[PDB]
Symmetry: D3
Subunit: 281 residues, 6 copies
Amino acid sequence: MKKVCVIGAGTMGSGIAQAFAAKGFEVVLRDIKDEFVDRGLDFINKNLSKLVKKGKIEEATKVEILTRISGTVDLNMAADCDLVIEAAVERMDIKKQIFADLDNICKPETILASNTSSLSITEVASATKRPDKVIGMHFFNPAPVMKLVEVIRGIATSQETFDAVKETSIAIGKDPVEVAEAPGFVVNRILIPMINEAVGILAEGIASVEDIDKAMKLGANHPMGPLELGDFIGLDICLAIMDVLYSETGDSKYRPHTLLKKYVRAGWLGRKSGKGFYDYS
Amino acid sequence: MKKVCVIGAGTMGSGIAQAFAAKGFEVVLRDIKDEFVDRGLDFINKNLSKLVKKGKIEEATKVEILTRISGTVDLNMAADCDLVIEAAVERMDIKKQIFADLDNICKPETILASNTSSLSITEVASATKRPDKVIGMHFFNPAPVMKLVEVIRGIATSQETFDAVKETSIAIGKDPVEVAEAPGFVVNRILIPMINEAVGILAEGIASVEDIDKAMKLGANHPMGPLELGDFIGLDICLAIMDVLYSETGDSKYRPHTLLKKYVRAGWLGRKSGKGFYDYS
Amino acid sequence: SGLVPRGSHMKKVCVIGAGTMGSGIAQAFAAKGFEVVLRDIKDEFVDRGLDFINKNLSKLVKKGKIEEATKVEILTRISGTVDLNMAADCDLVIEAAVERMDIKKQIFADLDNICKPETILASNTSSLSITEVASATKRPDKVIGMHFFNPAPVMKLVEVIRGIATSQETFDAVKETSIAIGKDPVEVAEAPGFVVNRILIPMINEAVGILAEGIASVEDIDKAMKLGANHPMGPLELGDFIGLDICLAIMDVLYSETGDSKYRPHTLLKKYVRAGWLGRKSGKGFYDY
Amino acid sequence: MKKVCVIGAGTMGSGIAQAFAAKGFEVVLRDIKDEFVDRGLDFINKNLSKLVKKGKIEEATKVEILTRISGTVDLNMAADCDLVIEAAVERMDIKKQIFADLDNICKPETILASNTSSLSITEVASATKRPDKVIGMHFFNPAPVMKLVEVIRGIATSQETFDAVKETSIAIGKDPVEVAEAPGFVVNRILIPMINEAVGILAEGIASVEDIDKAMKLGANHPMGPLELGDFIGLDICLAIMDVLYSETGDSKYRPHTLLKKYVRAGWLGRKSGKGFYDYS
Amino acid sequence: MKKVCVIGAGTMGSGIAQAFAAKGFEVVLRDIKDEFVDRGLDFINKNLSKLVKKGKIEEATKVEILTRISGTVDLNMAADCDLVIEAAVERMDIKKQIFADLDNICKPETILASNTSSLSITEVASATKRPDKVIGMHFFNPAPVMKLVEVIRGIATSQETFDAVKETSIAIGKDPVEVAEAPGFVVNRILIPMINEAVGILAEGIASVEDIDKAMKLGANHPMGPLELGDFIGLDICLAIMDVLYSETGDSKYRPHTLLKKYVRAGWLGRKSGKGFYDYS
Amino acid sequence: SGLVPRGSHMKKVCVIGAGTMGSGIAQAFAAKGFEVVLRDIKDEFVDRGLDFINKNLSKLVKKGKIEEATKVEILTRISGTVDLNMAADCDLVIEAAVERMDIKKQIFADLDNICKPETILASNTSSLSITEVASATKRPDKVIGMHFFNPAPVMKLVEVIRGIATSQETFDAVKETSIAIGKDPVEVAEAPGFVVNRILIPMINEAVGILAEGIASVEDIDKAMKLGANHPMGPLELGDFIGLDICLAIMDVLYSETGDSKYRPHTLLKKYVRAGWLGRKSGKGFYDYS
C-alpha cells in the first residue's frame, strides 16, 4: 500500500490524512465542495504549526508532509488508491452510495474502509461487489496522535484484507486491534456505559459530580473521571452511542439515562458548549 | 478524635490500623484469636519493613508506629475509642452482633464504622441504638497507600457523624467522598460492570483478551485493561459484586456474565490463583 | 341457626388465628348470625382476640350503631378454643395464621383429616399460593382463598381466590356466604397480587422512585395523586399506613413469582425498611409520626 | 402577572382560559381560525351557563368573566402578555415553532409555558433564547374545576420563573406542585401504569373488567376503577402515555400491554367512542 | 360460500387460489398488472402439471381447476365474492387502502381476509365499516399442500364470521385453528424464537451449526434443525418476525440476536441467496 | 474385553445411580459389549435398576429385536454393587445420581481418590455446572458431561459437555466411546441448558404463555405446531410427556444462570406444577390422561 484516499475532510478525516502523510504516504483527499476541502487542509496546517512551534518537528517537514496531501472533489481521484478510508457523515444511505461508487471507480485490489463508529460495516459492504475488501478502520480523536485503531471486520471481510490493513496501521505507527463487528466495538461498548452509570448515580443523589469523578480518578486510578470525560467527549456523542447500543442489542441494559437525555436536550453538551455536568465559563 | 479501634486483622483491617498509627493515632487491633492478631501485626511489621528498606521511612517511625498499635481480643478494649471500624468478614448475621455489642460497650460519643463493600450500612445500624453515628468507611486495598475513602451514609447517619469521619479521614492523609448508601457505592458500581462488559465481549468472540485490554488502555488511557484488572482484583470478588448489584437492584442490567461464572467455578480467579483471563506462569 | 341468611347453605364457620384479621373475620360472621369457632394455639392469644372483638363491638354500641344487648348476642356466637378438633363439623374454615407455606400446609393437612368431607377450607393469605396449599390436602377442589381487607368487619370487598383445582361448586358456595355476610366478592384466578395488591402496591413503589430521583417532594407526590386522581390518600402516606415492610414483601413476591423486572422493588424502599422506618406503626416512614 | 394568553381553544385551552378569567385575569385566547376560537368561546359560555343555572354564580358574574376574554387568530396579540400558555397538539416540531415565534413576539418578561403531558420542556425551551423563562404548567381536565397543576421545571427553568408561575397558580385558586422534568411527571407516571396493569390482569383471565374495577373501588377506596377510568381518560391517550414512558426511560417495565394496543387499534377508545372496556350503549 | 377473490398473484396468492379452485370454488385472482396475473396463472399451471406428471390428479381435473379461475387487474371484480383474501402488501397503509375500497366495492355479506403474519387484523378492520366481517386467514407455504390455516380473529371479528371461515377452511381440506390476534399468532410466535435462540448458542461458541442442528433433529426429533430451518424460511423473514415480536410486546425477551442481524445485513439470507448458516453453492 | 468395539480404547465402564437414566445408560453400554458396574447406595435400588433393564430387554425379546439368550448375555455384563470401590479400575465413570451439587461433589471427590489416574469421570446432569463439579477433584481435565436422552438405550444423541478445564484428550475419548456404543455425540461448551433444553424448553414455556392469554386452546396450540412446523408432538403434549416439573426446573435454571428475564418461567406453569398436574406421569397436566 502506497497511496491512500481519505474521504471527508472533517475533524476525523483530515486528522487521518495527516497521520498518513506524516509517514510518507501519497494521500488523496476528497470532500464535496472546495470550501470543505480547504477548511480541511487549513485544519491540518494549523496543526503542524503547533508542532513546529512546540519544536516537535521542523517547518521543513510540515511543508514536506503538506505536499503529500492533494485536496479534491472529483471522487475519481481514488481510482488509483490502494486503500480508501471514508470518514463522512454518520448516515447509512450515503455511505452505501459512496461505497457503491468507489466499488466502481477503484481498481479491484483497492480496499474500502470506513471510520464509522456506529453503522454496520457488514451492511455497507453489501452495497459493493467486493465485501471481502470492505472493512472498518476506527481511529481515535485526535487521529495523528492517538495510537489505537480498532480494525473492524465485517462478517465478509477476508483475512487478506484484515492483514493488509493491520500492516498499514503499523507502517503509520499505529497499534491495531482486531474486532468482529458488534455494537460499540470494544472501546465505546465499555467506556460509554460507564459514563452512563455515572450519570445514573448522580441522578439518584448518591454522590456529586466532583466526588464521582474523584472516586473514579483515585479509586480506579483513571486519568479523568466519567462525567468530566462525558463533557470532554460531548454528551450528545455519548447519548447517541448509548442509543446505538440499545437499538442494536435490544437490551435494556444499555438504555441511556433519562438525565443524560435532559442535559443534551438543553444544549448542555459539555466543553464544546461551555456547559455539561461542569461549567466552562 | 484520637483513639481508634479496628476489628479484623486480615489484610484490610491490618492496613487500616497501620494507616491510622502512621499519622499518630492510638490504635487498638481486635480479632477472635491471637494467631490472627499476631498474624496481622506480623503483616504490618513487613510493609513497614519493606518501607524502611527504601528512603520511605526511618526505622524510628517503624518502631514508633508499632508502639501505638496494641492488639487484643478483648472487644471490651474498644470502650474508650472515639471511632471504631469493623473490617471482619462479610456475613450480616455476624456484623450485626459485632455492632450490637459495641453499641453497649462504648461511650455515647463513639462512632461505629464498617468497611464492607456489599452489606447495607443502614441495616447494620439497625442492630444498634445509635444509628445516627453509624457510617461506612470504605477503604481501598492497600489501605496505607490508597488515598480514597468512600464515606457511606446510612440513611439515619447524622451529618455530624459524617463531618467527623470526613475530618478524620483527611486527618490521616486520605481524600474522602460523600456517598449515600446504594449498591456498589461509586467505584464498584461503575468499575465492576465494566469488567463484566469486557468478559461479554470476550465471550462473543469479538476480540481477544489481549486486544480488549489493549484497546481500553490506548483508547481510554487506562493503566490496566479490564480483564487484567479483574484478574488483579480477583474474579470471585468481581462476581460477588455483580451478584450484589443484580440482587439489590433487581435489574437485569447488572447480571454477571455466564462466562465469568464459569471462570470462578474452575478456581481460575486471577493472580492469586495463578490463572484467570491470563495465565500467570 | 335460622339466623343465618338463607342465601348461604353453609352455617358454621371456624376461623383459625386470633390476630387482627382473624378476630375481625369471626366478628363479621358472628355479626351476621353465624355460629363461629375461633381457634388459636395459646389461651392467651384467643383471649386477646375475643376482647379485641369486644373492644370493637363496644365502640359500635357507643356510636349508637348497635345496641349493647346486640353486642352481647354476637360475642355469644363466638366460642374460643385451642382445640383444632372443634373445626370438625364446621362447614367453612378460614385460616388467618402466619404466612409460612410449611406451617400453613400442616394446618390444611390436619384440617383435611379432621373435618367432614363437605367442609371448605380457605386461606386469607395475600402472598402464598392457594394451589400449593391445596396440594397438601386430599380435597383440593374444596380449597380456596378468601382474601379479606382490614378492617374485616367494615371492609366489604372479599377477593375470592380460586385455585387451579378449586371447583365451581366450592367457589359458588363461598360467594353466596360472602354475600350473606354483607360482603362484595370478586372472583379471582390465583395469580400474584390477585387484583388489588397487584395494581396498588406498584403504585406506591412507583412513587418512591419518583421521590428518589428528586422529581418531587413527598408532600407534592401525595398532593398530586390526591388532587389529580382524586385518591383518598397519597401513595407515600398509604405505604406508611399499610406498612413499608409489608409493601416491600409484596413487591418481593411479585418479582419472585413473575420473574419480571417490572416489579422490582425500589432500592430506596429497601433502605427505609432496613432502617426500621416502616411508617405509622413505627412512628416514622416517609413521614414523621 | 395580569395578562395571560392561551394558545389553543380546544377543551383544555378554553378551560384554562376560563379558570384565569374567572379569577380576574385578562385572557387572550388564540387559535389558527376563527371557527376554533368561536368554538372554545361557545364551550366556555355553556360551562358558565351551567354554573348560573346551577346557582353557583350569577348571570352577572358570568358576563364579567366573558368580558375578560378576548379571542383572536393572531399570535402577535401575545406580545404584551405576562404569561403565555400553550395547549396545542402534542407534536414537537410544532411546539418548537410556536415557542420560537413567541420568543420573538413577546416582551422579555413574558413567561412561556406548555400544558404538555408528554413532550420535553427542556427540549422546547431550547428552541428559544429564554430557556430560563420556559416552564411546564400542567392542568387537569376539566381545568376550571380541578385544583391541581403540575409545575414542570425544565433543567434551565429559573427559580424566578418557577416562583412566578407558582404564585400565579395560587392566585387562580389552584394548588401547585413542583416537578422537575421527567417522563409522566407525577400523576400520569403513577396513574397510567396502574390502568395498564389492570389490562394485564384482564388479559390473563384473572378477573373480569367489572370485578377488577370493583376490587379497586372497594379495596383501595378509589372513586373509579382503573378500566372505567381508562375509558374516561381515553384509551388512546392512555396508550400514548405508556408509549412515552417506555420510549423515554427505555425500560420494559412501562411497556404497554398488548391488549391495550388492540383496543385502541379497534377504535374502542372508551366513552368518546361509545366503547372501550365497557359498552356505553 | 362459493366465490372467492384472491388479491395478489405472487407465490402465496396463487397458492391460495389453487387451493380453492382445486376444491370446486370459483376464484377470481387479482393483481395490479396483466404481467403479474399471468405469472401467477403460469405458476399454478406448472403446479398442476407436476401433479398430473406424478399421477396425483387426472389431466382433465387439471383443466377443470384452471377453468374455475379468472384473472383480473380490477378490484371491482371482487364485488359479488363471498370471501376475499388479500395476500400481497406487507405494508399497513396499502392494506388499509385495499380493505377500504373492498368495503365499498363488495356486497355487505362479503368477508374480508388477510394472509398477513405481522400486521394487525384489528387495525386493518378499522379502515372498514364492517370490522365484524374482517378476519385473518393465515396460510402456510406451499398453500395447496399445507393443511393448517391459522384463523386470526380481530377483537371485533364476530363469531359468525369466524364460523364461516372455519367451515370453508375445512371445505378446502384444511385444518383451522382459532387464534385471537396477538403477535406471531401461534406458529411464528413459538418457532421463530427457537431459531433466534439457536443463533445465540452459535454466537457464543457453545456449539457449531452442524451440532446444534443435529442435536435438535436427534434430541427433539425435529425434521430440520433450527439453523437450516432459518436458512429455508429466509433469515430476512426470521429477523423481521422477531422485530415484530419485540416491537409489539415491548419485551426484551424477543430481541433478535445481533448475529442474525449481521447475516441479514450481509445478504446471506439462506437457501434463497446461496448462503446463510450453511453454504448452498 | 474382546467383545468391546475396537474404536473405543475404554473398555470398563461404571455407572453411578440405578435410577431410570443410570440403568438405561448401563444397558446401553452392556448391549454393545461393555462390562458395566452399576452402583447405587442400597441393594434395593440396584435391584430396581437391574429389574428395569430386564424389563426393557424382555420387550425387545417380545418384539423380536433380540433373542432371549442375548438378553441374558447382556444382563451378565452388568454387575450390581453398592461398593463404590468397584469403580477404581474402570476407564469411564458416569454419574446419573440426584440433581444436587453438594452430593455430586462428594461422589466426584470420592471417585477422584478411588480411581486410577486415567479414569474419566462424567456426569449426566442436565442442570449443574460440570466445571464446578470438576473443581472438587484434582483431575478437572478428566471431568466431563455426558448428557444422554431418555430412554438412553434408544436415543442416539449424547451431548458432550466440556467444562472449561476439560481436555481435548478427554473429550476425544468420550466421543470415540460414544460412537462405539452407537451414539451420535455433539460437542458442547458448558452453558445453561446446553443445546437441546435451551431451545426446547423455552418453546414449551412460550406455548403456556399463549394458552394463558386465551390466544389459542391447548389442542389448537399443539395442532398448529404439528401441522405448521411439522413437529411430531405439540409443545404442551411434549411438556406433559417430559414432566411439567422437569420443564419448570429447567427454566428456573436457565433464568438463574443467565439472569435474563427472557427465560423466566410462566406463571401458569408454576401453577400447574404446584397443583401436582405434572403431565402423563400424574395422569394430568395440560391434557387429562385416562
